[PDB]
Amino acid sequence: SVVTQPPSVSGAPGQRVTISCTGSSSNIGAGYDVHWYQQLPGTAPKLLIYDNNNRPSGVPDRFSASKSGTSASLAITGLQAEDEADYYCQSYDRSLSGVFGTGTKVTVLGQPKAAPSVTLFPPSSEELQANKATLVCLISDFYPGAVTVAWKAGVETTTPSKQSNNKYAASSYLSLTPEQWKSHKSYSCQVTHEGSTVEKTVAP
Amino acid sequence: EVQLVESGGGLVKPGGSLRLSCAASGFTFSSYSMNWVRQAPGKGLEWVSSISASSSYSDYADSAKGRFTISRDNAKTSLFLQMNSLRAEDTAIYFCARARATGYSSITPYFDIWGQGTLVTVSSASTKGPSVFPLAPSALGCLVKDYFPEPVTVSWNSGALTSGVHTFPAVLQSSGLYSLSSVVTVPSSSLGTYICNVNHKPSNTKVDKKVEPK
Amino acid sequence: LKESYLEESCSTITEGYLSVLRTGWYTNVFTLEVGDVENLTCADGPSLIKTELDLTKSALRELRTVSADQLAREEGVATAAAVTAGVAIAKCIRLESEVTAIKNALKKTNEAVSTLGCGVRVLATAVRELKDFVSKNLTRAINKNKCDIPDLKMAVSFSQFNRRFLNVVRQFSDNAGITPAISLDLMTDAELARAVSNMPTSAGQIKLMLENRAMVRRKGFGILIGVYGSSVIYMVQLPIFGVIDTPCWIVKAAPSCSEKKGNYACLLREDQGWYCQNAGSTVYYPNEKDCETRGDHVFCDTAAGINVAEQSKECNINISTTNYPCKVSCGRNPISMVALSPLGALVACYKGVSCSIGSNRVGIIKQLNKGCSYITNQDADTVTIDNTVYQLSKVEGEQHVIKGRPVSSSFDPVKFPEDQFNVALDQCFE
Ligand SMILES: *[C@@H]1O[C@H](CO)[C@@H](O)[C@H](O)[C@H]1NC(C)=O
Ligand SMILES: *[C@@H]1O[C@H](CO)[C@@H](O)[C@H](O)[C@H]1NC(C)=O
Ligand SMILES: *[C@@H]1O[C@H](CO)[C@@H](O)[C@H](O)[C@H]1NC(C)=O
């Protein structure tokens, strides 16, 4: 089947974190080896580990890995800020050939937790004149970069990006026909950061 | 220097065709198996196809079987991927990668050199200028609604407001068009002027809206 | 294939071969069950069953002794490397825990995958036909040590079921526990196909291996683990060809001599043999025995190679190049000989020998001139030097010549230096 990884892993600077790689009988269980890549945002993947546990020449010793049965794991012993990246495991499948794990984002928690500031903007009259209505819920200055925003259909949310001050920021857009904005008394976007919910509402 | 340089990426309509080319330099090209790996926007790595050093063996992922054909020319040290019947899900950055296999305990290929990749965009959409509507300070901003393709830059006050501003990432809609937002935080006492400078170089459009309270 | 005669150096290069280089080993462990034959006897006089029983009992007793000697001693560059690696795995399996693990995993089926305590992942195979015959048929039909029975079917079956065991004992006794190759008795063709399929390789490797089983049996070998009761445990190392499809070429050469009134000045390329590209390195095999050919495919062992600079290939275009010290052997003593190439033959005819090329239906085609001549396999079937007849191959391909005055024609035989062996072409002039 598909090789799965945890979507996210996080740790403090100097912490040891592990990334699992869950294969199956047709790949790792079939005797195939596991490789690992590190990908910084915007760049090509870089070889990090080959043949289960060997480091290429330019890879520091804090990276180590192993393989066991139908799974593998990558260890980073002593996270540093530069280790924040996406990590992919890789093997070969008897029927699917080259297979890549689903990938893991590693966050290095180098900052205190910060609650998000939410500013919900109502549809501009100019846009209603264009027979269009979009509500823009803007989330800002939060740490770490992971948030769930809610309103049902017509929802488009950007994955948390990183702004200045090294804090994170996200945005969500509810598209409605002009009639629908006049139909309801109020619309609201709820932002959840670290189990905490912030709700801003807008009324026509 | 060991280098791979992909080329041939661009926009294409569903059912269209493109041919990607990788220029290899700095190593003995004919000694190595070569691969194509792709990565959809915000998604994971996905192996596409491989070809052996002398083209005796080739392999493809189920998605590429029939539609895609890999090939190489060792004389020019170049790799090629012929893609036909392209669909929207083929939108990705396509990487060219040199493969290695130790062959001690198994034959499990790893990729030790990657090119920077070329973007392949499959869409029924055509180049479109952005429509800029203002976000009312009542936190001030301007929203770009439907533009194509992705490249779009948003400045504020001709770059004067460089501190206290974030341009968000774009969102693709069922329409196949893109929409961005740029926000600004200033003193709620400095209301009485900030201008939203936008540029869609693809369509050669430059919009300069100003933000004002309700 | 494409062969080029290099007239300047009396040599040939044949290109267009594709590598199949052994990089590793896949271990298939076997448990050949003989059964309790030592608790059976024939007190009847000469008999067919008695003959077979005594052969089986003795073969099993001899194996315990070849095993003891082997264990004592264990507690070609490629052959030496292969044995070292296999013996390391054999010491792992020889541990008591691993044997019983293997036997247990094989109690429910005749084939199982297992990972040893050493981390080596192996295939285990049960061969039970001999034990099953002995326990379910022979032990009972010999009620009271009576082996002269009139069944005849029993004797035939006993002979049929035990010959694989006898042949295995012979190979391990004749080779001190380490066979040179993989016989059909160590691994049948069905077992080889099963193991080849179970290997973690690519579908291409699997086809090349199943279409070249005889080559697989020559590259692999077997190691005796030991005799644990009535169970013979041995391992077979199957080759893993991790480098494949890279370009390879073979260089052949013959002595190129000029002559001035009985005095000779000779040149011989000392870089003959196989060359294969291997991951940014050119690998050189000076012994043509280290590589075997099957069509365009050349099978070699990565452990027997020598790394050479990629500029060494320029000795096949201009031996007098200044970009690489092409190795040659010079001297005043001509040697007449024939160097067979894949698509022809180099013939070096000097002093008082007679050289000719012949046809299998016409006979002598012509006499050859003195010096070096290149014969294609389409112009002749044979080359003869004096009474020695060399058969040319029938392989088809492109033939090419790189014309050029032989470098040895510039040497002055009159006062030519003594024999310089393995030197640069400039050192031969003076
Ligand atoms: C072994 O041989 C003895 C003596 O003939 C006999 O009594 C016994 O039943 C045999 N046991 C087995 C293993 O069948
Ligand atoms: C061996 O024993 C089995 C028991 O079912 C029997 O069917 C088979 O015919 C026997 N073989 C001989 C040689 O009698
Ligand atoms: C071979 O190399 C030598 C030295 O570089 C050069 O002078 C000559 O022209 C080249 N060609 C031949 C075939 O001699």
Coordinates of C-alpha atoms and ligand atoms in Angstrom, one line a residue, chain C residues 132-133 136-137 151 153-154 157 161, ligand 2:
Chain C
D132 CA 9.0 -38.6 4.7
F133 CA 9.9 -41.7 2.7
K136 CA 6.2 -43.2 6.4
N137 CA 7.5 -46.1 4.2
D151 CA 8.5 -55.2 -3.5
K153 CA 9.1 -50.4 -5.8
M154 CA 10.5 -49.7 -2.3
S157 CA 11.9 -45.2 -4.4
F161 CA 14.5 -40.1 -2.9
Ligands
LIG2 C1 4.5 -43.8 1.2 O1 3.5 -43.7 2.2 C2 2.3 -43.1 1.7 C3 1.3 -43.0 2.8 O2 0.1 -42.5 2.4 C4 1.8 -44.0 0.5 O3 0.6 -43.4 0.0 C5 2.8 -44.1 -0.5 O4 2.4 -44.9 -1.6 C6 4.1 -44.7 0.1 N1 5.1 -44.9 -0.9 C7 5.6 -46.1 -1.1 C8 6.9 -46.2 -1.8 O5 5.0 -47.1 -0.8

